[PDB]
Automatic annotation (TrEMBL), chains A, B:
Superkingdom classification of source: Viruses
Protein name per Swiss-Prot or TrEMBL: Structural protein
């Protein structure tokens, strides 16, 4: 999310009140990106594809073994 | 305070008792005064005013050194 910050009067040095110029205003942004290159991976099958695994469990995220 | 003075009989010269006229009655007064002219001294501040002295003592009247 874009952000904007403005300093308060108590934080302005006395010198700037004579110069009458404010400083330290800050803004932030995130730039998008276009797409330049793409790489694809195809596959071809000739004979009868082999039967797939018949597991119906919901795939677990990671191994439980950890110490 | 206004003052009034009246002489006594013993102090009246014999001649006035024949002339039958009294003298030497005295009165005093103090007159007030109007205001005619006024002079002012202003001041302006631009930057942050400097911090004042932080003395909390009751201001002394006059220097003790005297011989």
């Amino acid at each position: 999310d874009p952000t904007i910050i403005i300093p308060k009067r108590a934080n302005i040095p006395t010198n700037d009140l004579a110069a009458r110029i404010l400083r330290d205003v800050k803004v932030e942004l995130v730039y998008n990106n276009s797409l330049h290159y793409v790489k694809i991976r195809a596959s071809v099958v000739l004979d009868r594809p082999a039967g797939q695994s018949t597991n119906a469990q919901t795939p677990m995220s990671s191994s439980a073994v950890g110490v």
